[PDB]
Symmetry: C4
Subunit: 185 residues, 4 copies
Amino acid sequence: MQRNTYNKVGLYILSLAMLFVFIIILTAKIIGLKKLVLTNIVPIVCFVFFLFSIYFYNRLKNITKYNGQDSVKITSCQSESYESLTFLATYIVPFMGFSFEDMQKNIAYLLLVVVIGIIFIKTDKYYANPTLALFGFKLYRVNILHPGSGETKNLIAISNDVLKVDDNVYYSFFDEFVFIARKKI
Amino acid sequence: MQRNTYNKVGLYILSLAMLFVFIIILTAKIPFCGLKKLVLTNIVPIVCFVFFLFSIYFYNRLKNITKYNGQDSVKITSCQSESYESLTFLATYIVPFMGFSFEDMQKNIAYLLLVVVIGIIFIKTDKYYANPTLALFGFKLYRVNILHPGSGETKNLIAISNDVLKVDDNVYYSFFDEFVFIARKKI
Amino acid sequence: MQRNTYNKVGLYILSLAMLFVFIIILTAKIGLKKLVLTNIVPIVCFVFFLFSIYFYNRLKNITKYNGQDSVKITSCQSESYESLTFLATYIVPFMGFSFEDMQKNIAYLLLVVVIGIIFIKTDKYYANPTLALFGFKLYRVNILHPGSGETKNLIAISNDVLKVDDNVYYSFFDEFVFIARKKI
Amino acid sequence: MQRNTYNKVGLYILSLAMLFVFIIILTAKIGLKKLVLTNIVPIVCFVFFLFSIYFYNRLKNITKYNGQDSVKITSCQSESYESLTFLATYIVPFMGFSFEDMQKNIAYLLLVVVIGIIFIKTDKYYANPTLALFGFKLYRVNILHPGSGETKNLIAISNDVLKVDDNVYYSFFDEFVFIARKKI
């Protein structure tokens, strides 16, 4: 339960990484180093989320590095390629002027991004935010066959590589709704 | 007739409950320390606080709707996972420049007329069940064909429930309006 | 062509009429010629609202026309999409940005006219559920005109619910759509 | 490969052609180089306004390339979507954004590019209605080349109107999506 949820939010934090770079180039109050961290209190507290996202980006590729225990079977392929652009129109646009010169206001903006965190995970739509396509992630439904268990029903999968039809390659499961794939050497 | 519109707009207030919590946390005024001037600055926070208590009351009302069992027939078959959940309705309701902006009072009631016009024009188009804030409270949305104990089979109507429900399970229900309805699980 | 485009763009005018009656309250800043001179955009959007009143009564007078018009409909089916990207690009801008300078207000009126010509050319006028606030419902219906023949499921607009296979009244917009009434 | 992408980005950069027309109006500041130094955001987008004209004559050269190409299309069908999620995100919200300060004005120009890097890779550059403002009506076509086989529901771009099942002319963006026009 816990380990299915900590990796779950990691794509969403990776999905907000393209948002996070704007705040540095939107908040530029630029020697009294105590005053600079006082005046520019907002970029120095959001830069760690850039460090969080890169850490999850290295984490996401490290799941694919585990190759000593993975199973290898895929039946068929289908590239649906939705990547719904409406999510960009929900989460990145409404922070026009993210730092409107009052920290009490800026609590609510940071309150907004975490409340939609529970919203946009529990609705199970995190894999269609088009910021994930910036990192070359291709989306597709494939009904695989497991080597041990039976046939799956056209499950949504996200991966960085283009798959041909019925290619028995490596992968790694995320849950029984989505997973992460690989290629066979 | 009046109760259908009443619990329709009550579900709309439950959808806007997070907007309400955001706007108490947004436009509350700092004392940092004669109270009547602070109350005069507290007018938008207190009216949306009354709105938030209305949301609490209608959430308790929905729990009461789950609680009446004496007049409840069961008679449920099948299940189909529709799961539409269009987030554009979130992007229009809960972020009107994030609710309100703190400059002018007549502009504030202009946004008040904006949100009540939005309320009437999305209750008149029979698609109130749209926001992904109902799923924040734990609800899930999917469309199931139902037979009646007295009447026959429905025609692919929308259902709403909190607890998890599956195919051909004979479970409880409520009656929101003549079209959509709330379900539970049979104990 | 001129009358067809005129009563085509009038639906979009009535769509934006709700935005105009918001912006009356939005930009109202209250020997009165100074008050006239400062609040010129309430006056011109009030004029636009009067144009909306004129077109609402114009299509109402169109709906009274049933004698000289042909009145033949068969069948019915309902689609009823009326999505909200239209209102997301219509109302949400005018509450999104700031509205002070008249020089930039000229550019916002140029927004209005170019988004009108976009929504005219691409055939997305029959949209923005502000129309459905005025009793309107959307569904495509294959109608029969026995002088001409059977049509193929063209999208239709009416202010009343119409069921299947009823020889109700209509009035004709242009080569694809029409407004509809109910027979007596 | 190399020549495909530079023509692929031209559809997006001409879809923002009218966006440049209001930036010179929204930030209209009206020896004399100090006047130029104030209004850098009109005069920079006036250059891509000239680039929008430049690609508009360039795409006509693509249609008017030569005569040995552009052989035949067998079938035709229509989709005509012009989905409006791309509007209110691409043309509109920059006016929803405000231009008053220098450091944001560079920062919103990075918001232009990071849209387009996504928008190219999502393969959605046949959907802006601003491209349809220039007279283009957009519709998928199954084609059969004489020397090649039958392709499966590829996307066609055409200014002038075409009917169904006619052997007509074309031109290429790349192998997948293509320009269509009419046979003399």
